[PDB]
Amino acid sequence: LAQEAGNFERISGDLKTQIDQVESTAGSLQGQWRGAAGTAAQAAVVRFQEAANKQKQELDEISTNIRQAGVQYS
Amino acid sequence: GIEAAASAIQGNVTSIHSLLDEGKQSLTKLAAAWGGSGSEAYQGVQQKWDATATELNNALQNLARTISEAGQ
Ligand SMILES: [Zn+2]
Ligand SMILES: [Zn+2]
Ligand SMILES: [Zn+2]
Ligand SMILES: [Zn+2]
């Protein structure tokens, strides 16, 4: 678990990075939605942002758990 | 433009899917942190992960496909 901890922080970091990429790409489109398909895309954005914020939150709760168990096991 | 965006986001889709799978496998090995493999708290972590992950993947796939559909 000790060594698995580093790998999880790596995964968490990679995920947050990929998620930052999506948020950045999507954000660069905030201007330009038009029509019904644009409405659909905006909604798709908001759905992704909610899913990604939940994922991030989860990653942080898990990391905290792991750190706190580490202390315990030490 | 919107085509670019949509293409970049497809890469994200695949990468994030892979990372969520890696994270699930990691949790398997971190199971002690919630009391071990037979812990209800651990089981709860894994169900939460599965659910969060699936929603993310789902949202992501939706995003990619909608963004391309719009630019069309
Ligand atoms: Zn490992
Ligand atoms: Zn990386
Ligand atoms: Zn990998
Ligand atoms: Zn998979």
Residue numbers in the entry:
A (entry chain A): 11 to 84
B (entry chain B): 10 to 81
Text lifted from the article:
WXG100 proteins are a group of proteins of approximately ∼100 residues in length that contain a conserved “Trp-Xaa-Gly (WXG)” motif. To investigate how specific sequence motifs translate into specific structural features, we determined the atomic structures of two representative complexes, the heterodimeric CFP-10/ESAT-6 complex and the homodimeric sagEsxA assembly. The overall structures of the two protein complexes are similar, with both forming a four-helix bundle, in which each monomer consists of a helix-loop-helix structural motif. However, the novelty of this contribution is that by using the iterative bio-informatics approach, we can show that the WXG100 protein superfamily can be divided into three subfamilies: CFP-10-, ESAT-6- and sagEsxA-like.
For example, the NMR structure of the CFP-10/ESAT-6 complex shows a heterodimeric four-helix bundle with flexible termini. More recently, we solved the X-ray structure of the same complex (CFP-10/ESAT-6). In contrast to the solution structure, the X-ray structure shows better ordered termini which adopt extended α-helical structures. In CFP-10, the WXG containing loop (residues 39–45) is three residues shorter than the corresponding loop of ESAT-6 (residues 39–48). In addition, it contains a 310-helix with hydrogen bonds originating only from main chain atoms, whereas, the loop of sagEsxA (residues 43–48) consists only of a single tight β-turn. The side chain of Y51 is located at the interface between the α1 and α2 helices of ESAT-6 where it forms an inter-helical hydrogen bond with the hydroxyl group of T37 and an intra-helical hydrogen bond with the side chain amide group of Q55. In particular, the indole ring of the conserved W43 is oriented towards two helices and together with Y51, W43 blocks the top interface of the helices α1 and α2. In addition, the WXG-motif of ESAT-6 forms an extended hydrogen-bonding network, where the main chain amine groups of W43-G44-G45 form hydrogen bonds to the main chain carbonyl groups of A40 and A41. In contrast, the WXG loop of ESAT-6 adopts a more rigid conformation due to the extensive hydrogen bond contacts. A FRET signal could only be detected in those samples where donor-CFP-10 was mixed with acceptor-ESAT-6 or vice versa. These results demonstrate that CFP-10 and ESAT-6 exclusively form heterodimer and that heterodimer formation is a spontaneous process.
